[PDB]
Amino acid sequence: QSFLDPKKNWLAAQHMKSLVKRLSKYGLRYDDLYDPYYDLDVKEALNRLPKEVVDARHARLKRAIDLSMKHEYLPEDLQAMQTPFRGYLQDMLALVKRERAEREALGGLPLYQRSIP
Amino acid sequence: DVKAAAMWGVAAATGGLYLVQVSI
């Protein structure tokens, strides 16, 4: 997209800078914000993801929650070493969504449905 | 225990006298 690219848009660049600063404080990637209970496509993608990646995501989430509980951020060195937006879930999420789309198009039934709360 | 029951009765009586406060 044109306006969403930080190179071509100054507003998008400032938004990306602010998002990087916010994520690096708690030391968790952008894809860590995705909730498995939200879409269940994230749930399927994380199920298909390797155990090492899933464990690293869970460790990052635990660290972020502990930092939020302690009312403190990561130290400066760890914030510098933090690398948000290094995707690990977007490709598999897109693959799951494509599979769901083709299943819906060719009749079929949903492989999983969100339970009525 | 007899002593424990007696002390708990004393505590309950003190609470009742704090609540109702008959002749303070």
Partner: protein, 51 residues
């Protein structure tokens, strides 16, 4: 003013007493919460992750 609010003196006395007593309660409750959360807010966590 007395006829409209004949309970002003008793109300103000009770309010002063309870405001002071409940400020002391707020101090104690903050201490209690910080003591109960002391184990969680002063713990070291090793997680095997850097980024």
């Amino acid at each position: 003013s007395w006829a409209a609010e004949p309970e002003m003196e008793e109300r103000k006395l009770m309010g002063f007493k309870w405001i002071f007593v409940l400020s002391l309660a707020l101090l104690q409750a903050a201490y209690y919460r910080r003591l109960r959360w002391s184990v969680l807010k002063s713990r070291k966590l090793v997680l095997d992750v850097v980024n």
